[PDB]
Design a protein around this ligand. Structure first.
Ligand code: ZN
Length: 337
């Protein structure tokens, strides 16, 4: 089945730039950073080569790697190549635009380096503007430690970059930091300007925040691990698709086992869900492997797996012509199975 799942056309809707870095690139850039004294490489080297402690370690180091434009451009290209190689036909790539007055980096310039990364792709054909071919669109993430003001800078930037494929805004970062009330006004501005919205939601128990995010009616949410019954009821009546990150939830212990993961309940209740990687480099997985885990856990046929993969199209933030092309790609690949 794994060869079949790897050839299946897939849609990735929750993948972070910083977390999708290939390990070889991580090793190389880490070594050059330590060779500059910016860090000691022995502390990172063996992990770079599993546990919760360790994945937090990698997140740490990666923040330090992504401080120069060249690196942002490179990892953007490599991430698009890797996803395309496993037959993702549509990718919404999210990242947090990052400021560093020192390196001359603004959020705008960081994002420009991302666009340069998309233009530099050569191993696959790419559509991002309006041999494998991959459609790429961008989500700008607001980090939970930002202020309302900073969040608004991210939203304004996203609106200016709609011509190069920015389709929406995300809220992410440590779910124990910050207050919804800080980010609601910026996200409302985004939504009122017809950007699409996805929210990391319910990653920790937080009943009031979960209800406020649901009441906002974003266009998608990520995870939903600690929803209560009234949360599920509101989610299902509002019909908000859930980005399901199986390995991520398991490794971080937001969900105790795949056998109780709510993605099964959502699937059987005919609620829209999309299997996503979250950070495939950091979590040592891939979209094909996430599909493998889900197919095994639910006991899906090839037919049900294909219908599930195809159903993600109407949850994308892409323009209608892109979605019609995706419907064509899936119609056209169903013959295989
Ligand atoms: Zn995430």
């Amino acid at each position: 089945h794994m060869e079949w799942i790897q050839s299946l056309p897939k849609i990735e809707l929750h993948a972070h730039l910083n977390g999708s870095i290939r390990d070889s690139t991580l090793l190389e850039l880490a070594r050059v950073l330590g060779e500059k004294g910016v860090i000691v490489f022995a502390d990172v080297e063996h992990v770079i080569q599993r546990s919760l402690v360790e994945v937090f370690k990698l997140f740490d180091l990666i923040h330090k790697l992504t401080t120069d434009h060249k690196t942002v451009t490179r990892i953007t290209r490599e991430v698009v190549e890797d996803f395309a190689l496993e037959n993702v036909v549509y990718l919404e790539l999210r990242t947090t635009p990052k400021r560093s007055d020192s390196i001359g980096m603004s959020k705008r310039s960081y994002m420009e380096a991302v666009i340069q990364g998309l233009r530099s792709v050569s191993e696959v054909d790419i559509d991002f503007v309006t041999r494998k071919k991959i459609y790429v669109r961008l989500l700008l993430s607001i980090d939970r430690r930002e202020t309302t003001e900073s969040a608004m800078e991210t939203v304004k930037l996203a609106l200016e970059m709609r011509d190069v494929g920015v389709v929406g805004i995300d809220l992410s970062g440590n779910p124990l930091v910050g207050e919804w009330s800080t980010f609601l006004p910026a996200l409302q501005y985004a939504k009122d300007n017809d950007l699409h919205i996805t929210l990391h939601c319910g990653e920790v128990p937080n009943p009031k925040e979960i209800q406020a995010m649901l009441d906002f009616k974003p266009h998608r949410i990520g995870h939903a691990c600690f929803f209560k019954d009234e949360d599920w009821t509101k989610l299902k009546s509002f019909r908000i698709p859930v980005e399901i990150c199986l390995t991520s939830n398991i490794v971080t212990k937001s969900i105790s086992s795949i056998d109780i993961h709510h993605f099964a309940d959502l699937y059987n209740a005919k609620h829209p869900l999309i299997l996503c990687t979250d950070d495939f480099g950091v979590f040592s997985t891939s979209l094909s492997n996430e599909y493998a885990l889900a197919v095994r856990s639910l006991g899906l046929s090839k037919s049900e797996t294909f219908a599930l993969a195809r159903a993600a199209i109407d949850a994308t933030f892409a323009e209608d012509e892109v979605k019609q092309q995706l419907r064509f790609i899936f119609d056209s690949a169903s013959p295989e199975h």
